[PDB]
């Protein structure tokens, strides 16, 4: 017995090759979906990000308003913010 014409492109892969080509790839993908999630916690669990969003919006505004020095200072501030996790916690705290 032979596969129907519609499912032929499945039959092309041998059952063992059907495991290796498709099954193992899906397994690797789902494993990598949750492989190292603990490491990327500091930047993915911020309570409030309104201040950082405002900082980015000010960067974008000053980029077009031509006050280039203000852009340099804001970029330095953002880099330092992402450089120290304690200031990140302080800025991501929720206000009244």
């Amino acid at each position: 017995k032979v596969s129907p014409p519609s499912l032929g492109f499945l039959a092309g892969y041998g059952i063992v090759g059907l495991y290796v080509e498709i099954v193992l790839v899906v397994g690797k993908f789902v494993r990598g979906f949750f492989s190292e999630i603990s490491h990327s916690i500091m930047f993915e669990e911020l309570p409030c990000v309104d201040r950082i969003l405002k900082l980015c919006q000010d960067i974008f505004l000053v980029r077009e308003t031509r006050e280039l020095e203000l852009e340099e200072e804001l970029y330095a501030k953002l880099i330092f913010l992402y450089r120290s996790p304690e200031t990140m916690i302080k800025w991501t705290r929720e206000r009244e």
Binding site: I15, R31, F34, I41, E45, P47
Partner: protein
């Protein structure tokens, strides 16, 4: 104010501190292991025999006070603060010192007498496994329904029922010795296959049960009520059930022709490489996988009524499958067949473990990995190997998250699990 704000509410104040010699050594170790494995029964026998010696020595005319004459060495303790009797201590000193292999046999007999309830089931199962018949089927199933499902005893009158049944069966087979094969064990051949051994073991158990002191429709309503009580032994045996299931899977993988329409001892790798995909292998794997998934669901949900219903369905289905349609389709009934009986024996081990778990109940402490108990190098290596195989970690994690009680989302659960694995 809500759940999310409780999640995102952490601060530093939470973290504030406030040759022949080798053979002799091996047999000595074996005797030591047996003694450690039946020490409680040895102490039981010792205290009982001391009390019996006191009771018999005083037997001049009559022992009149049940407590008083025994109270020369308040009435509810399990300890030993008694006097000393020279003949006793000289008896166990003689038994201890001057013995090389006699003590080994004594320890073995002490062990078998200490259990006296496991070898009865083992002999019943073996006798049914060597003589498949509808006559020899009711006893194993009603062992798996009464004997292992009566909590504060093996049973009350199930034993006498077993004696009466083997009585009637051996008498009927003897009379018939002057489709019957499926109907019973009436054939003009060796008829008392294991009935004598089963009867002797059963009566030995009866004698032990009597000598060490015990007995010998609303009724079923009470029976099912007592399977729902409080504070039983509370011990979990699950990794052993999983190991039995894995053994069954391995047996199916290596031996699967014996369940096909005609066994040919063909290999499985050849068939898959040649693109054949035998039907029986597929169906056994699907049935076993579904059984393990249901078992894990029941264990995680921590319910006994559901587990009891699953057990009563599974045991009857497995018993109906064999001795029946399965040897009906292939003429290798049971004795000629080789691996079906081994698979059945493993499944009876699984049934015994499941019934023990049902009777004992579920301990509060679960969800701990059955490898994260002691931090040895072997444990680390084997746990890493476990986490290496594809689809097992994710499937286990999702099954846990769905079927335990928690307030977390799947991503947070995965964060916790990854943190735990790394820390371990």
């Amino acid at each position: 104010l809500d759940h999310a704000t409780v999640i995102h509410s952490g601060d530093y104040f939470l973290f504030e501190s406030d040759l022949w010699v080798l053979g002799q050594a091996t047999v000595d170790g074996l005797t030591r292991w047996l003694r450690a494995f039946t020490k409680h029964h040895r102490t039981m026998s010792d205290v009982l025999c001391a009390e019996r010696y006191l009771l018999t020595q005083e037997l001049l005319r009559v022992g009149e006070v049940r407590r008083g004459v025994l109270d020369q060495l308040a009435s509810e303790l399990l300890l030993d603060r008694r006097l000393h009797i020279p003949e006793l201590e000289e008896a166990e000193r003689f038994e201890a010192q001057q013995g090389r292999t006699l003590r080994l046999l004594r320890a073995g007999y002490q062990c078998v007498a200490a259990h006296s309830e496991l070898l009865c089931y083992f002999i019943i199962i073996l006798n049914h496994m060597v003589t498949a018949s509808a006559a020899s089927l009711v006893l194993p199933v009603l062992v798996f329904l009464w004997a292992m499902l009566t909590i504060p005893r093996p049973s009350k009158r199930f034993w006498m029922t077993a004696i009466v049944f083997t009585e009637v069966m051996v008498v009927t087979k003897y009379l018939f010795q002057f489709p019957p094969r499926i109907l019973g064990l009436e054939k003009t051949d060796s008829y008392i296959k294991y009935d004598l051994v089963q009867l002797m073991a059963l009566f030995f158990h009866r004698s032990q049960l009597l000598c060490y002191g015990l007995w010998d429709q609303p009724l079923q309503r009470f029976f099912h009520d007592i399977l729902h009580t409080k504070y039983r032994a509370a011990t979990d045996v699950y990794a052993l059930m999983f190991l039995a299931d894995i053994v069954d899977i391995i047996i199916i993988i290596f031996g699967f022709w014996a369940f096909g329409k005609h066994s040919a001892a063909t290999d499985i790798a050849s068939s898959l490489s040649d693109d054949q995909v035998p039907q029986a292998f597929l169906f056994m794997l699907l049935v076993q996988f579904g059984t393990m998934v249901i078992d894990r669901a029941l264990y995680l949900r921590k319910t006994v009524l559901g587990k009891l219903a699953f057990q009563v369905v599974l045991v009857v289905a497995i018993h109906i499958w064999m001795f029946f349609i399965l040897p009906a389709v292939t003429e290798r009934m049971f004795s000629q067949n080789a691996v079906a009986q081994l698979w059945y024996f493993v499944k009876c081990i699984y049934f015994a473990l499941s019934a023990y778990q049902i009777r004992c109940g579920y301990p509060t402490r679960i969800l701990g990995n059955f490898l994260t108990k002691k931090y040895n190098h072997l444990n680390l290596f084997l746990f890493q190997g476990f986490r290496l195989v594809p689809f097992l970690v994710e499937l286990r994690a999702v099954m846990d998250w769905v079927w335990t009680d928690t307030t977390l989302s799947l991503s947070n659960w995965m964060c916790v699990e990854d943190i735990y694995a790394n820390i371990f």
